[PDB]
Amino acid sequence: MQDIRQETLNECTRAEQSASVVLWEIDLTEVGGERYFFCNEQNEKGEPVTWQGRQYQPYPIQGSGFELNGKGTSTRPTLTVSNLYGMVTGMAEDMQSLVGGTVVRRKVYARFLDAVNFVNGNSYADPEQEVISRWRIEQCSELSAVSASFVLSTPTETDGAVFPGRIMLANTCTWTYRGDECGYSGPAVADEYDQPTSDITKDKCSKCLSGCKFRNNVGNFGGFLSINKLSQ
Amino acid sequence: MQDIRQETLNECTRAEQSASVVLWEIDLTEVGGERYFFCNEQNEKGEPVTWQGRQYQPYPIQGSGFELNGKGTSTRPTLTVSNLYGMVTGMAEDMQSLVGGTVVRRKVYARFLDAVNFVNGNSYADPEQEVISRWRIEQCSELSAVSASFVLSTPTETDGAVFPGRIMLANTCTWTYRGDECGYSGPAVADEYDQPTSDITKDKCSKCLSGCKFRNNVGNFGGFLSINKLSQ
Amino acid sequence: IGPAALKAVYDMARKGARDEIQTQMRDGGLFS
Amino acid sequence: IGPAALKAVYDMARKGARDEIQTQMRDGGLFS
Amino acid sequence: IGPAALKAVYDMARKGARDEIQTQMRDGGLFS
Amino acid sequence: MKTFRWKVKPGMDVASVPSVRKVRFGDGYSQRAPAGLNANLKTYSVTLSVPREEATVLESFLEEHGGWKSFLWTPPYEWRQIKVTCAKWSSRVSMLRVEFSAEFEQVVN
Amino acid sequence: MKTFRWKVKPGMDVASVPSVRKVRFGDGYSQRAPAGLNANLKTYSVTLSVPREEATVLESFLEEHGGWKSFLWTPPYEWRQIKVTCAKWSSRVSMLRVEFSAEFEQVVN
Amino acid sequence: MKTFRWKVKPGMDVASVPSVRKVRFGDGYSQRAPAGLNANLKTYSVTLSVPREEATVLESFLEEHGGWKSFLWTPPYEWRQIKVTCAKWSSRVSMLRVEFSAEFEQVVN
Amino acid sequence: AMRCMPVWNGQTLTFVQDRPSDKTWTYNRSNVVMPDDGAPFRYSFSALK
Amino acid sequence: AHRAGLWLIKTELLETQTVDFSVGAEGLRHVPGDVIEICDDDYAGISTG
Numbered sequence: 001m002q003d004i005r006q007e008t009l010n011e012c013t014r015a016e017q018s019a020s021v022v023l024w025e026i027d028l029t030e031v032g033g034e035r036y037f038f039c040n041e042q043n044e045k046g047e048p049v050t051w052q053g054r055q056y057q058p059y060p061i062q063g064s065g066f067e068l069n070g071k072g073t074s075t076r077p078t079l080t081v082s083n084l085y086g087m088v089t090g091m092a093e094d095m096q097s098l099v100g101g102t103v104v105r106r107k108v109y110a111r112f113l114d115a116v117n118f119v120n121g122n123s124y125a126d127p128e129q130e131v132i133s134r135w136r137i138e139q140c141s142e143l144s145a146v147s148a149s150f151v152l153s154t155p156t157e158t159d160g161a162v163f164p165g166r167i168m169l170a171n172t173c174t175w176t177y178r179g180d181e182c183g184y185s186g187p188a189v190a191d192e193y194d195q196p197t198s199d200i201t202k203d204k205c206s207k208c209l210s211g212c213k214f215r216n217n218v219g220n221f222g223g224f225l226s227i228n229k230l231s232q
Numbered sequence: 233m234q235d236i237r238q239e240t241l242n243e244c245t246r247a248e249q250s251a252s253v254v255l256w257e258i259d260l261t262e263v264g265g266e267r268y269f270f271c272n273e274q275n276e277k278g279e280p281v282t283w284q285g286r287q288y289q290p291y292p293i294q295g296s297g298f299e300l301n302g303k304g305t306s307t308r309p310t311l312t313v314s315n316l317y318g319m320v321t322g323m324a325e326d327m328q329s330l331v332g333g334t335v336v337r338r339k340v341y342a343r344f345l346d347a348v349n350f351v352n353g354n355s356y357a358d359p360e361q362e363v364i365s366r367w368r369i370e371q372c373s374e375l376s377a378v379s380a381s382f383v384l385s386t387p388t389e390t391d392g393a394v395f396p397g398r399i400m401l402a403n404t405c406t407w408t409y410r411g412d413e414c415g416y417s418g419p420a421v422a423d424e425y426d427q428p429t430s431d432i433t434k435d436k437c438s439k440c441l442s443g444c445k446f447r448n449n450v451g452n453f454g455g456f457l458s459i460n461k462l463s464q
Numbered sequence: 465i466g467p468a469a470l471k472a473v474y475d476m477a478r479k480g481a482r483d484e485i486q487t488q489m490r491d492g493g494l495f496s
Numbered sequence: 497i498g499p500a501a502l503k504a505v506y507d508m509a510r511k512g513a514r515d516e517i518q519t520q521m522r523d524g525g526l527f528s
Numbered sequence: 529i530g531p532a533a534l535k536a537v538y539d540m541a542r543k544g545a546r547d548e549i550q551t552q553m554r555d556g557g558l559f560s
Numbered sequence: 561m562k563t564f565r566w567k568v569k570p571g572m573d574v575a576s577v578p579s580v581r582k583v584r585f586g587d588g589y590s591q592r593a594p595a596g597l598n599a600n601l602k603t604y605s606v607t608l609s610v611p612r613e614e615a616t617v618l619e620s621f622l623e624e625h626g627g628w629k630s631f632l633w634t635p636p637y638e639w640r641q642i643k644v645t646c647a648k649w650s651s652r653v654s655m656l657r658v659e660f661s662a663e664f665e666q667v668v669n
Numbered sequence: 670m671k672t673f674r675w676k677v678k679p680g681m682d683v684a685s686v687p688s689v690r691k692v693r694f695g696d697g698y699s700q701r702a703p704a705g706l707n708a709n710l711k712t713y714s715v716t717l718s719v720p721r722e723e724a725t726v727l728e729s730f731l732e733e734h735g736g737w738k739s740f741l742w743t744p745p746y747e748w749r750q751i752k753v754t755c756a757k758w759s760s761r762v763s764m765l766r767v768e769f770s771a772e773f774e775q776v777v778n
Numbered sequence: 779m780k781t782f783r784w785k786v787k788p789g790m791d792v793a794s795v796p797s798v799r800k801v802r803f804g805d806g807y808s809q810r811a812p813a814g815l816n817a818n819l820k821t822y823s824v825t826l827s828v829p830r831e832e833a834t835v836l837e838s839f840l841e842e843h844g845g846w847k848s849f850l851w852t853p854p855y856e857w858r859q860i861k862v863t864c865a866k867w868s869s870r871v872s873m874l875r876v877e878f879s880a881e882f883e884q885v886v887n
Numbered sequence: 888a889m890r891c892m893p894v895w896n897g898q899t900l901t902f903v904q905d906r907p908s909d910k911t912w913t914y915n916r917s918n919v920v921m922p923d924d925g926a927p928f929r930y931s932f933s934a935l936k
Numbered sequence: 937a938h939r940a941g942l943w944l945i946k947t948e949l950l951e952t953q954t955v956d957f958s959v960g961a962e963g964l965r966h967v968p969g970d971v972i973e974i975c976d977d978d979y980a981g982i983s984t985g
């Protein structure tokens with residue numbers, strides 16, 4: 001079942017419905033950007049739409065093909081944004097083409113916007129009645145001087161992944177540096193190569209046996225020293 | 233070659249052709265139903281078309297896509313029938329969606345129908361000149377409240393069948409009850425769960441060793457008593 | 465008039481391709 | 497008319513898909 | 529016009545079939 | 561099964577296209593067949609003009625049969641008493657008279 | 670629920686196409702069904718003419734209802750108090766009086 | 779923002795098609811919605827007739843905005859001061875006076 | 888194994904199975920919309936093989 | 937294993953009908969996915985539902 005409130009569910013069955021507004025939120029904080037609020041529509045005063053106090057500025061946007069299914073390939077709805085004045089290109093070259101971010105789609109009925117969007121003032125206002133979905137951007141399939149097309153995907157999508165993620169053994173380690181399994185917290189001693197150093201900026205581990213010998217941490221080495229089992 | 237009589241082949245040479253008539257027979261005796269006779273059109277008297285003495289009633293029927301071939305896939309022509317007043321749905325809800333029945337298509341020329349179909353009376357009637365095909369219904373791809381589409385198939389088509397039907401088992405029989413291998417003809421002794429019953433309506437073997445021991449036909453058991461061939 | 469016809473034909477062609485794949489993947493045929 | 501156009505497009509999107517299936521599996525395609 | 533529409537529909541059907549082949553061979557589907 | 565005795569204004573149009581089975585060969589030799597047993601079914605275009613008083617009566621009668629029931633109607637002077645159905649009708653209402661312009665498609669039993 | 674009391678000029682057109690489930694046989698016997706309960710829904714083409722000073726008022730009314738709200742209207746002399754919505758209207762502002770042409774589609778509640 | 783003070787000839791056209799969200803159900807009961815908030819946007823068809831001497835001036839002004847800039851224009855007698863763009867102007871130069879036949883599409887801010 | 892199916896429902900991955908449950912909502916001719924064909928409900932059945 | 941096989945055969949034998957239809961906005965927002973609802977149809981039931 002959905003989390004839709006009783007009153008909006010009751011209203012949705014009415015024969016004379018109101019306008020349907022769709023608002024989009026693009027979040028890049030997990031990538032290193034900001035939060036952008038877009039709305040395909042504005043109010044009657046030529047102003048950005050005010051919802052829950054915040055303002056969604058008017059900007060071109062259109063979502064298509066939102067499907068949910070349990071069988072076959074996971075659905076990939078698309079999003080179209082007009083790239084005029086190079087606004088999208090301004091962040092595409094900075095945020096690595098908007099790959100890895102999050103998009104949030106909220107749908108709302110027109111009779112629940114804030115009173116400031118209507119000249120007379122809506123008395124039937126409730127800022128806690130909306131339907132929310134979230135997806136992640138996958139790729140920018142098209143980018144030109146007039147538009148831009150993004151593909152969306154479910155966060156849980158399991159394309160191109162393998163279940164057991166261990167290589168068992170090698171001549172090299174198979175973890176991170178200073179994680180919760182390597183368990184190193186000392187001063188800098190080694191860098192990308194096997195060269196002594198004492199700066200925290202260029203602390204790197206070659207993930208070989210020599211790095212462990214340098215860091216006096218061999219008991220946590222993730223490489224089984226077999227080698228000759230394949231030969232002999 | 234076809235079983236085409238000389239007279240109809242000779243008639244099918246002249247420029248001024250007669251009217252082609254197609255009649256359909258749905259046979260459900262092998263599945264538990266009756267024989268239905270359909271024709272796409274009626275005579276000039278507003279009466280069912282009389283052929284070979286029997287009568288075909290008018291009903292909207294259309295067969296399309298009869299493609300006999302030796303390579304690639306099999307043949308799956310489509311039969312469309314108008315489902316008005318719920319007539320098709322009535323038998324579909326009863327005859328398991330018309331699955332397993334037979335359809336016979338007979339094509340005839342107009343100048344060979346019975347004399348009762350014409351006000352003047354045809355003097356060229358010959359109720360032995362027609363072309364006959366038979367198919368089996370595979371599925372009801374779509375039956376709405378206005379129509380119904382059936383997929384047809386050849387009776388001898390192989391799909392999902394394996395050649396070596398024999399299967400080696402350990403403690404389960406492989407054949408039917410009383411059919412040919414279980415040469416049992418005595419009173420009912422067992423039931424599904426191997427209970428001591430003596431009623432014939434509930435006598436069904438459990439397909440085990442205990443059932444055979446109950447019925448004293450262990451000499452005709454299909455399950456080889458190997459079991460322990462993979463442990464050692 | 466314009467891109468509406470293009471979208472219609474695109475969806476129709478995709479559906480036809482799906483049907484062709486399904487019918488060719490079956491026992492008979494070239495086993496796509 | 498509608499249904500004639502729809503049947504025409506459906507039947508036209510058959511041999512196109514068949515040829516695509518056949519060419520993409522020959523030497524250096526995706527093997528259908 | 530006949531031939532121009534025919535060639536356009538054929539090419540669009542080929543593109544649609546290629547796109548369907550590409551999209552159905554990702555992780556699931558019928559794995560064409 | 562009701563009938564149709566309303567007067568018909570002059571200028572009634574008649575159309576008839578028999579359904580035939582045409583197939584052409586190299587030099588003519590075109591095989592032709594009558595297709596169905598009763599192929600051609602005439603369709604009439606009929607216009608009436610009545611004062612407003614019984615425009616309601618005509619509209620009600622045309623509404624009763626809807627677009628599915630058939631009704632007997634004798635074409636003017638024609639040797640047949642055929643049964644017909646209609647599915648389109650329009651009216652130009654004026655302050656004195658209203659004129660109807662309908663089409664009557666012949667169907668058999 | 671508002672009403673529509675403006676006058677309608679002569680020549681207003683009425684169209685009616687009831688919905689039926691056509692399905693054809695070889696020849697004749699074509700089965701027919703009445704489809705839904707409310708099959709036919711008349712479509713009206715209404716012409717008006719008002720002096721310029723009045724026109725704005727009518728416009729505002731047609732603005733208030735938009736193309737999504739229904740309003741009662743009585744067709745001239747017709748025995749029915751139907752409910753109708755409009756989504757197409759145009760006008761000719763010539764010199765003194767402006768004439769409107771609008772379409773009115775019948776809708777159930 | 780510039781203003782349009784050129785005077786317009788009789789016969790100007792105004793057209794209005796509201797954008798509504800329509801879905802029809804079983805026996806009627808069509809759900810209707812207003813779609814966007816400012817759904818209604820009029821479209822005018824405007825004809826002028828000016829002597830050739832100032833004809834160039836019109837073109838110059840109509841060249842300045844191209845088809846991407848909006849200018850304010852008060853329609854005749856109408857209670858609104860709206861902003862409108864045009865992209866399809868044409869002229870009929872004959873001997874002494876050229877007539878212009880353009881279309882003016884209303885656009886929100 | 889557990890006779891389930893995963894779906895991205897309500898912005899969360901959830902799993903459904905053929906557990907006997909109660910009715911949720913009802914539909915008839917009034918709540919559904921028919922296409923141009925004439926009938927709103929389209930049924931289909933499985934195949935013999 | 938026997939229970940799994942029995943479930944497969946029984947589910948495949950009994951559930952043999954699939955129906956598709958359309959629904960307005962209210963129903964679209966109502967049903968999230970993979971729920972149980974009654975689709976009562978007077979056409980198939982030759983009655984007045």
Ligand code: SF4
Binds near residue numbers: 174183207218
């Ligand atoms: S190699 Fe030794 S030090 Fe470098 S990461 Fe793996 S464990 Fe930590």
Ligand code: SF4
Binds near residue numbers: 405410414449452
């Ligand atoms: S088990 Fe023994 S008895 Fe039961 S069927 Fe197979 S053979 Fe006949």
